[PDB]
A = this chain, B = another copy of it.
Amino acid sequence: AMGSMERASLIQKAKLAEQAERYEDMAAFMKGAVEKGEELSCEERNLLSVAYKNVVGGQRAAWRVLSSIEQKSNEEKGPEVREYREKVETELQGVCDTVLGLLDSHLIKEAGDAESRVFYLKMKGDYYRYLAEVATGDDKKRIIDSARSAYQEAMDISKKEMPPTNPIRLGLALNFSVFHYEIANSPEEAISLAKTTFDEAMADLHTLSEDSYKDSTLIMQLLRDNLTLWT
């Protein structure tokens, strides 16, 4: 759909769309940029993630509102709440499938540097996690395992190739710990991962510049916030 627009123009317009809080547009511009077939830079990977994370984040929040109403309804309100929750759920699944399709065709296979490959595998884990949040049928276990497998591959690369304060490594561990707690029914694994990640980052802060320290400590605080909620 964006096939006739220049890559550089799509990137520029994604940045404008973020400033205007037009995240659906942002995501469409970044989908068009990925489909040009070239690898993405660090900055461009962040534009792609910001765009889709915000779109699906809004869908998730709406699905949760509707699912809560539906559960309370289960006086007969008729089929409308279930129908509308199903409509939002199908849209959410469609966006997740789109993101997963971009990662599979062909972002992951072309990503050789640890920073890019971990970034994309963390995204893959996240979008299977979002699918798992709404899954109920025969594929629910397989969707959960697909998230797990992507996060695990990202973890294995991150532990070999990045320092324990690297912000991508930290964000990956944060999100995988959320997976363990909220999806996999493994709260002890979630707590252990968050604690070990936090403590190993703390011990490496002394190596960092002021700007790297700020980024690592920001994500450490998120780990700590979850640990406070979970313990």
Contacts and interface: CB of A to CB of B under 8 A. Distances in A.
Interface of A: 9, 12-13, 16-17, 19-22, 58, 61-62, 65-66, 69, 77-78, 80-81, 83-84, 88
Contact of A9 (B13, B17, B80): B80
Nearest to A62: B20
B61 A16 contact: no
B88 A20 contact: yes
* Tally of this chain's copies: 2
* Residue among A16, A77, A81, A88 with the highest chain B CB neighbour number at 10 A: A16
A64 to B, nearest CB: 9
Contact of A84 (B17, B61, B78, B84): B17
The 4 closest A-B pairs by CB, nearest first: A20-B62, A20-B65, A12-B80, A13-B84
A9 B81 CA distance: 10
Contacts of A77: 12
Contact of A80 (B16, B20, B61, B62): B16
A61 B22 CA distance: 10
A62 B9 contact: no
A80 B22 contact: no
Given A13-B84, A84-B13, A20 B66 contact: yes
Given A12-B78, A17-B84, 18 more contacts: A9-B80, A12-B77, A13-B80, A13-B83, A13-B84, A16-B69, A16-B84, A19-B65, A19-B69, A20-B61, A20-B62, A20-B65, A20-B66, A20-B88, A21-B58, A21-B65, A22-B62, A22-B88
A26 to B, nearest CB: 11
Contacts of A80: 9, 12-13, 16
Contact of A62 (B21, B83, B88): B21
A17 B81 CA distance: 10
A80 B17 CA distance: 11
